PDB file of N, CA and C in Angstrom:
ATOM      1  N   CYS A   1       0.841  -1.227   0.000  1.00 22.89           N
ATOM      2  CA  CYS A   1       0.000   0.000   0.000  1.00 22.89           C
ATOM      3  C   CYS A   1       0.870   1.269   0.000  1.00 22.89           C
ATOM      4  N   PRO A   2       0.349   2.426  -0.524  1.00 22.97           N
ATOM      5  CA  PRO A   2       1.117   3.684  -0.583  1.00 22.97           C
ATOM      6  C   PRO A   2       1.078   4.504   0.723  1.00 22.97           C
ATOM      7  N   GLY A   3       1.746   5.668   0.698  1.00 20.86           N
ATOM      8  CA  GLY A   3       1.797   6.561   1.850  1.00 20.86           C
ATOM      9  C   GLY A   3       1.569   8.007   1.459  1.00 20.86           C
ATOM     10  N   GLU A   4       2.132   8.933   2.245  1.00 17.95           N
ATOM     11  CA  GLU A   4       1.988  10.376   1.997  1.00 17.95           C
ATOM     12  C   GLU A   4       2.825  10.829   0.792  1.00 17.95           C
ATOM     13  N   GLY A   5       2.124  11.255  -0.269  1.00 22.15           N
ATOM     14  CA  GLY A   5       2.779  11.715  -1.486  1.00 22.15           C
ATOM     15  C   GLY A   5       3.031  10.591  -2.479  1.00 22.15           C
ATOM     16  N   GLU A   6       2.132   9.597  -2.498  1.00 22.42           N
ATOM     17  CA  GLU A   6       2.263   8.451  -3.402  1.00 22.42           C
ATOM     18  C   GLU A   6       0.983   8.235  -4.211  1.00 22.42           C
ATOM     19  N   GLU A   7       1.104   7.472  -5.311  1.00 23.68           N
ATOM     20  CA  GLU A   7      -0.029   7.172  -6.194  1.00 23.68           C
ATOM     21  C   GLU A   7      -0.889   6.046  -5.612  1.00 23.68           C
ATOM     22  N   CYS A   8      -2.194   6.312  -5.496  1.00 22.02           N
ATOM     23  CA  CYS A   8      -3.140   5.345  -4.944  1.00 22.02           C
ATOM     24  C   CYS A   8      -4.349   5.156  -5.857  1.00 22.02           C
ATOM     25  N   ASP A   9      -4.925   3.954  -5.809  1.00 22.91           N
ATOM     26  CA  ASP A   9      -6.104   3.613  -6.602  1.00 22.91           C
ATOM     27  C   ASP A   9      -7.319   3.457  -5.684  1.00 22.91           C
ATOM     28  N   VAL A  10      -8.510   3.667  -6.245  1.00 18.63           N
ATOM     29  CA  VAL A  10      -9.763   3.561  -5.482  1.00 18.63           C
ATOM     30  C   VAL A  10     -10.508   2.245  -5.768  1.00 18.63           C
ATOM     31  N   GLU A  11      -9.893   1.370  -6.572  1.00 19.04           N
ATOM     32  CA  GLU A  11     -10.504   0.091  -6.938  1.00 19.04           C
ATOM     33  C   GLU A  11      -9.944  -1.067  -6.112  1.00 19.04           C
ATOM     34  N   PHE A  12      -8.605  -1.158  -6.010  1.00 18.84           N
ATOM     35  CA  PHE A  12      -7.955  -2.249  -5.258  1.00 18.84           C
ATOM     36  C   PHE A  12      -6.622  -1.831  -4.605  1.00 18.84           C
ATOM     37  N   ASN A  13      -6.232  -0.556  -4.749  1.00 20.03           N
ATOM     38  CA  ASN A  13      -4.969  -0.073  -4.172  1.00 20.03           C
ATOM     39  C   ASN A  13      -5.166   1.241  -3.377  1.00 20.03           C
ATOM     40  N   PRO A  14      -5.964   1.219  -2.265  1.00 23.78           N
ATOM     41  CA  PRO A  14      -6.200   2.418  -1.432  1.00 23.78           C
ATOM     42  C   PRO A  14      -4.986   2.779  -0.558  1.00 23.78           C
ATOM     43  N   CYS A  15      -5.083   3.910   0.162  1.00 22.48           N
ATOM     44  CA  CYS A  15      -4.004   4.372   1.043  1.00 22.48           C
ATOM     45  C   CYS A  15      -4.031   3.607   2.371  1.00 22.48           C
ATOM     46  N   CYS A  16      -2.838   3.272   2.892  1.00 21.93           N
ATOM     47  CA  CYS A  16      -2.715   2.524   4.154  1.00 21.93           C
ATOM     48  C   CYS A  16      -2.886   3.437   5.387  1.00 21.93           C
ATOM     49  N   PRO A  17      -2.126   4.576   5.500  1.00 17.23           N
ATOM     50  CA  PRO A  17      -2.257   5.497   6.649  1.00 17.23           C
ATOM     51  C   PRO A  17      -3.559   6.335   6.575  1.00 17.23           C
ATOM     52  N   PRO A  18      -3.891   7.189   7.604  1.00 17.79           N
ATOM     53  CA  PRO A  18      -5.117   8.022   7.581  1.00 17.79           C
ATOM     54  C   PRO A  18      -5.054   9.147   6.529  1.00 17.79           C
ATOM     55  N   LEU A  19      -5.000   8.739   5.256  1.00 21.85           N
ATOM     56  CA  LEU A  19      -4.939   9.675   4.130  1.00 21.85           C
ATOM     57  C   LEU A  19      -6.034   9.364   3.107  1.00 21.85           C
ATOM     58  N   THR A  20      -6.332  10.349   2.254  1.00 22.57           N
ATOM     59  CA  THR A  20      -7.354  10.205   1.215  1.00 22.57           C
ATOM     60  C   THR A  20      -6.722  10.211  -0.183  1.00 22.57           C
ATOM     61  N   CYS A  21      -7.359   9.498  -1.117  1.00 20.59           N
ATOM     62  CA  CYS A  21      -6.881   9.415  -2.498  1.00 20.59           C
ATOM     63  C   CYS A  21      -7.566  10.473  -3.370  1.00 20.59           C
ATOM     64  N   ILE A  22      -6.796  11.495  -3.764  1.00 20.77           N
ATOM     65  CA  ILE A  22      -7.317  12.585  -4.598  1.00 20.77           C
ATOM     66  C   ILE A  22      -6.418  12.789  -5.834  1.00 20.77           C
ATOM     67  N   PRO A  23      -6.999  12.863  -7.075  1.00 21.46           N
ATOM     68  CA  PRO A  23      -8.458  12.755  -7.332  1.00 21.46           C
ATOM     69  C   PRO A  23      -9.003  11.325  -7.180  1.00 21.46           C
ATOM     70  N   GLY A  24      -8.216  10.336  -7.638  1.00 20.98           N
ATOM     71  CA  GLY A  24      -8.618   8.934  -7.560  1.00 20.98           C
ATOM     72  C   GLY A  24      -9.573   8.524  -8.673  1.00 20.98           C
ATOM     73  N   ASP A  25      -9.324   9.025  -9.892  1.00 21.19           N
ATOM     74  CA  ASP A  25     -10.167   8.715 -11.051  1.00 21.19           C
ATOM     75  C   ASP A  25      -9.318   8.528 -12.329  1.00 21.19           C
ATOM     76  N   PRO A  26      -8.735   7.309 -12.569  1.00 20.05           N
ATOM     77  CA  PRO A  26      -8.839   6.121 -11.690  1.00 20.05           C
ATOM     78  C   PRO A  26      -7.821   6.140 -10.542  1.00 20.05           C
ATOM     79  N   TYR A  27      -6.638   6.703 -10.816  1.00 19.85           N
ATOM     80  CA  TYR A  27      -5.556   6.786  -9.832  1.00 19.85           C
ATOM     81  C   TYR A  27      -5.394   8.216  -9.317  1.00 19.85           C
ATOM     82  N   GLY A  28      -4.820   8.342  -8.115  1.00 19.74           N
ATOM     83  CA  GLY A  28      -4.602   9.648  -7.512  1.00 19.74           C
ATOM     84  C   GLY A  28      -3.427   9.657  -6.553  1.00 19.74           C
ATOM     85  N   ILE A  29      -3.467  10.581  -5.589  1.00 21.15           N
ATOM     86  CA  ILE A  29      -2.404  10.715  -4.588  1.00 21.15           C
ATOM     87  C   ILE A  29      -3.005  10.698  -3.179  1.00 21.15           C
ATOM     88  N   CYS A  30      -2.241  10.143  -2.228  1.00 17.43           N
ATOM     89  CA  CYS A  30      -2.658  10.060  -0.825  1.00 17.43           C
ATOM     90  C   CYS A  30      -2.323  11.370  -0.096  1.00 17.43           C
ATOM     91  N   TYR A  31      -3.360  12.157   0.219  1.00 14.80           N
ATOM     92  CA  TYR A  31      -3.179  13.444   0.898  1.00 14.80           C
ATOM     93  C   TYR A  31      -3.604  13.377   2.365  1.00 14.80           C
ATOM     94  N   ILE A  32      -3.086  14.325   3.162  1.00 13.35           N
ATOM     95  CA  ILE A  32      -3.395  14.411   4.593  1.00 13.35           C
ATOM     96  C   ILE A  32      -4.577  15.365   4.835  1.00 13.35           C
ATOM     97  N   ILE A  33      -5.621  14.838   5.478  1.00 11.68           N
ATOM     98  CA  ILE A  33      -6.821  15.619   5.784  1.00 11.68           C
ATOM     99  C   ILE A  33      -6.908  15.944   7.278  1.00 11.68           C
TER     100      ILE A  33
END
């Protein structure tokens, strides 16, 4: 799984730490909220 400042997917590759995937269409980045 990815971390802060990495490429993440919303289908089968989400973020591991308390981060969100933006934009995530299809792939995005794990940001801190």
